[PDB]
Amino acid sequence: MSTIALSEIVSVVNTSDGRLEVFGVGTDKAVWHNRQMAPHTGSPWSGWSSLKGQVTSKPVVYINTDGRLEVFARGTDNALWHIWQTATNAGWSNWQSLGGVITSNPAIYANTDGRLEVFARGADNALWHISQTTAHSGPWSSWASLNGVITSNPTVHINSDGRLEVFARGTDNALWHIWQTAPDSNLWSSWESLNGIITSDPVVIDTADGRLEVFARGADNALWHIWQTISHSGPWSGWQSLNGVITSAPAVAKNCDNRLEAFARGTDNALWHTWQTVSHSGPWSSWQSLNGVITSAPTAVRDADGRLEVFARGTDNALWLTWQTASSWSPWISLGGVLIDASAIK
Amino acid sequence: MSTIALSEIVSVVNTSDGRLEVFGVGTDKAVWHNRQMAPHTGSPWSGWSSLKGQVTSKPVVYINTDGRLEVFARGTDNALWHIWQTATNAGWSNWQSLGGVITSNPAIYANTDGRLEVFARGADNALWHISQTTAHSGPWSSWASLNGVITSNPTVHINSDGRLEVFARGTDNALWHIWQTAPDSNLWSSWESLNGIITSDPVVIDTADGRLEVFARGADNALWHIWQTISHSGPWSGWQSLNGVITSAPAVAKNCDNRLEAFARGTDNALWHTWQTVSHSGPWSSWQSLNGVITSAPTAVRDADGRLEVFARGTDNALWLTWQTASSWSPWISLGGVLIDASAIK
Numbered sequence: 140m141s142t143i144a145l146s147e148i149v150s151v152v153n154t155s156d157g158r159l160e161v162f163g164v165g166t167d168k169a170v171w172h173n174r175q176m177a178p179h180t181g182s183p184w185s186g187w188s189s190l191k192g193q194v195t196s197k198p199v200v201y202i203n204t205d206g207r208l209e210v211f212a213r214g215t216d217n218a219l220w221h222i223w224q225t226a227t228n229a230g231w232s233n234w235q236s237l238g239g240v241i242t243s244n245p246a247i248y249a250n251t252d253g254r255l256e257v258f259a260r261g262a263d264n265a266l267w268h269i270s271q272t273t274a275h276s277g278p279w280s281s282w283a284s285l286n287g288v289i290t291s292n293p294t295v296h297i298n299s300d301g302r303l304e305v306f307a308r309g310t311d312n313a314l315w316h317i318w319q320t321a322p323d324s325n326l327w328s329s330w331e332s333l334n335g336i337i338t339s340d341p342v343v344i345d346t347a348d349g350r351l352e353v354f355a356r357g358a359d360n361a362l363w364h365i366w367q368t369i370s371h372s373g374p375w376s377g378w379q380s381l382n383g384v385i386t387s388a389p390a391v392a393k394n395c396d397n398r399l400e401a402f403a404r405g406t407d408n409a410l411w412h413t414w415q416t417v418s419h420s421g422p423w424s425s426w427q428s429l430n431g432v433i434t435s436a437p438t439a440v441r442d443a444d445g446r447l448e449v450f451a452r453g454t455d456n457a458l459w460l461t462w463q464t465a466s467s468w469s470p471w472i473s474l475g476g477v478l479i480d481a482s483a484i485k
Numbered sequence: 486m487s488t489i490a491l492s493e494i495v496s497v498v499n500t501s502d503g504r505l506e507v508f509g510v511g512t513d514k515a516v517w518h519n520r521q522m523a524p525h526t527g528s529p530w531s532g533w534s535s536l537k538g539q540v541t542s543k544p545v546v547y548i549n550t551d552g553r554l555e556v557f558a559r560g561t562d563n564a565l566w567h568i569w570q571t572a573t574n575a576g577w578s579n580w581q582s583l584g585g586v587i588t589s590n591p592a593i594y595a596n597t598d599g600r601l602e603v604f605a606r607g608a609d610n611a612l613w614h615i616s617q618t619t620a621h622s623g624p625w626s627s628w629a630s631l632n633g634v635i636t637s638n639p640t641v642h643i644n645s646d647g648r649l650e651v652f653a654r655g656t657d658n659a660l661w662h663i664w665q666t667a668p669d670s671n672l673w674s675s676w677e678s679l680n681g682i683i684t685s686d687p688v689v690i691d692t693a694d695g696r697l698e699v700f701a702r703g704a705d706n707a708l709w710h711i712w713q714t715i716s717h718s719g720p721w722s723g724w725q726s727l728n729g730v731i732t733s734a735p736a737v738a739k740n741c742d743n744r745l746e747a748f749a750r751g752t753d754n755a756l757w758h759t760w761q762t763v764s765h766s767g768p769w770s771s772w773q774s775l776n777g778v779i780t781s782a783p784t785a786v787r788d789a790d791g792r793l794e795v796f797a798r799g800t801d802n803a804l805w806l807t808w809q810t811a812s813s814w815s816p817w818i819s820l821g822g823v824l825i826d827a828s829a830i831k
């Protein structure tokens with residue numbers, strides 16, 4: 140090789156054969172990827188390989204229900220583009236355009252029927268969407284709008300009853316959301332406010348007990364969170380603070396035993412984290428340091444050994460990596476590369 | 486409230502809200518279920534509740550891609566019957582017939598497009614199948630045959646590339662299998678032999694690295710296993726012995742960190758187990774005892790705290806339960822009930 144907290148720089152997944160794969164953007168705007176050779180913590184890596192393209196968003200990878208990776212990104216023409224594996228253990232298609240004009244990073248989820256659906260802000264600052272017409276395959280539907288006015292990158296998750304739900308910051312800086320009223324459908328609720336004042340993109344995750352929980356940096360630069368109180372249903376909890384003082388977007392992942400763990404850059408530019416103790420219903424720890432000097436938000440994922448691995452850009456613009464050990468965490472190692480923050484919203 | 490090793494007596498799942506739910510059969514041939522109140526190891530249980538019906542197979546629960554449980558069982562008329570949740574946190578439909586004439590327990594998996602497909606032996610001892618015509622819903626297709634001649638209950642899994650694959654003992658007592666040539670399709674391979682001599686129903690599981698691995702009791706009453714050598718592909722390994730002397734069918738589950746663990750009744754009628762050490766690619770332990778005096782094969786599942794829980798019938802015909810603790814395993818406790826082995830093949 141109008142603002143939000145500093146973004147995550149890579150998109151990462153644990154793939155169908157248990158290997159982590161990371162996607163980023165280089166200075167000449169191509170998408171690059173790196174993957175583990177073996178399905179274990181501390182595996183050697185491929186090194187960075189270019190998938191070409193010319194992107195103007197964060198590239199976002201998603202796993203189709205047949206196991207094939209597909210990467211979505213905004214192009215220089217502001218259309219949504221994508222590229223996909225022709226088989227789970229094979230090569231890639233060419234980059235192809237799905238048209239439209241978009242103004243955020245794309246957000247992707249599979250419906251219960253296997254059709255990917257993609258969400259992205261439009262030129263009008265509404266949330267637009269487009270979907271595969273058949274499971275894990277093109278061709279795609281026409282674009283349409285779910286309205287609203289949003290000021291952050293959107294994030295989508297699936298409820299435990301199969302209904303997609305999308306979250307995004309509004310013009311009043313509150314967290315807003317909208318949901319499918321039935322799985323696989325084009326029937327959506329109205330937008331509703333969950334209030335709060337947020338200063339990062341929201342992060343959403345499903346708990347062990349089937350509730351959506353959303354994390355975001357607050358107006359005080361603490362990490363805050365809010366959750367569904369009943370599985371796949373409102374009412375939501377109040378916003379609750381997890382404290383800390385964070386200088387990037389947060390990242391969240393589940394441990395082996397479903398205990399949630401949040402990561403973010405701190406005031407000293409080190410990686411910090413806080414986790415649930417005891418169980419997935421337990422109280423959160425104090426914030427503790429994992430060291431490093433990072434120039435992006437962290438990106439967290441659980442590997443095939445059930446350990447968390449965290450990636451973040453370094454002062455040299457390489458991607459660095461630390462992971463959980465029995466005792467502690469490993470020292471930061473470099474995966475090299477030269478990565479940029481290509482986020483469509485900053 | 487012509488033979489195979491003693492069966493598992495209940496069907497168990499970790500549900501969309503993280504609670505274990507178990508399904509069995511009572512002396513008057515109704516299906517009963519029991520569920521955890523809370524999504525944690527050692528949760529109190531509902532106790533046994535009747536779903537009615539009159540069944541002549543093991544009842545087998547499967548989770549639809551919208552999170553709704555659906556239970557399948559052979560009826561007194563030898564047709565396939567089923568009953569389903571009307572919503573993930575709600576009640577059940579009435580029992581409804583999907584017709585056909587079947588001679589094994591049903592085996593179920595969701596295609597990548599969300600359509601359940603059910604496999605069962607016919608009166609001709611071939612493998613027949615039927616599927617939902619749309620994702621997570623009826624109506625269902627017509628019945629059709631995938632041929633073969635089988636002598637055990639069949640088991641189905643999905644490959645890491647989304648192709649269903651079914652395993653069953655043949656007339657020569659070898660393990661045979663057959664697979665979809667494409668996800669979601671009605672295009673199947675020929676039946677092929679994986680050789681060996683097996684004396685239980687086969688158990689199939691996906692490894693962390695996307696390979697199918699099959700377990701079964703051998704002619705020597707040891708536990709044996711065999712696996713795909715490449716993710717979602719042949720060639721298969723040789724049959725390899727895990728030793729032991731087992732007096733029931735084996736059960737297998739994955740730990741938190743993806744380490745496989747096998748369970749079976751021993752010559753002393755206690756529960757015994759053997760596990761991978763170190764990681765999901767590590768060597769297997771010696772067989773060790775979990776005590777108890779059991780009158781069925783064990784049934785193993787990972788709970789929402791990432792601990793294994795094992796269920797087995799006791800000398801009083803109640804269902805008993807032991808689970809992993811930090812140090813060891815818990816003492817057996819009774820969930821009550823009076824359960825029978827309703828397996829369509831014994």
Ligand SMILES: CO[C@@H]1O[C@@H](C)[C@@H](O)[C@@H](O)[C@@H]1O
Nearest residue numbers: 287288289309310311315330
């Ligand atoms: C539907 O409501 C519109 O979109 C929301 C997400 C908010 O930005 C709100 O201020 C705006 O009026």
Ligand SMILES: CO[C@@H]1O[C@@H](C)[C@@H](O)[C@@H](O)[C@@H]1O
Nearest residue numbers: 431432433453454455459471
């Ligand atoms: C531990 O190493 C420190 O953190 C890494 C993430 C890099 O920024 C490196 O330049 C720095 O010395």
Ligand SMILES: CO[C@@H]1O[C@@H](C)[C@@H](O)[C@@H](O)[C@@H]1O
Nearest residue numbers: 633634635655656657661676
């Ligand atoms: C297709 O082959 C048929 O079915 C297999 C599963 C075996 O029972 C074999 O002996 C029989 O001839």
Ligand SMILES: CO[C@@H]1O[C@@H](C)[C@@H](O)[C@@H](O)[C@@H]1O
Nearest residue numbers: 777778779799800801805817
């Ligand atoms: C530990 O308790 C023993 O095992 C249970 C599974 C039951 O069979 C019980 O009758 C027996 O005393």
Ligand SMILES: [Cl-]
Nearest residue numbers: 165167168169
């Ligand atoms: Cl580049």
Ligand SMILES: [Cl-]
Nearest residue numbers: 176182183184
């Ligand atoms: Cl190496």
Ligand SMILES: [Cl-]
Nearest residue numbers: 191192233234
């Ligand atoms: Cl290209």
Ligand SMILES: [Cl-]
Nearest residue numbers: 330331332333
């Ligand atoms: Cl509102």
Ligand SMILES: [Cl-]
Nearest residue numbers: 294341342343
């Ligand atoms: Cl997210």
Ligand SMILES: [Cl-]
Nearest residue numbers: 382383425426
């Ligand atoms: Cl703190």
Ligand SMILES: [Cl-]
Nearest residue numbers: 153442443693
């Ligand atoms: Cl995994």
Ligand SMILES: [Cl-]
Nearest residue numbers: 478479480481
């Ligand atoms: Cl940059």
Ligand SMILES: [Cl-]
Nearest residue numbers: 511513514515
């Ligand atoms: Cl009964």
Ligand SMILES: [Cl-]
Nearest residue numbers: 522528529530
């Ligand atoms: Cl209690």
Ligand SMILES: [Cl-]
Nearest residue numbers: 537538579580
């Ligand atoms: Cl009924």
Ligand SMILES: [Cl-]
Nearest residue numbers: 676677678679
């Ligand atoms: Cl053959």
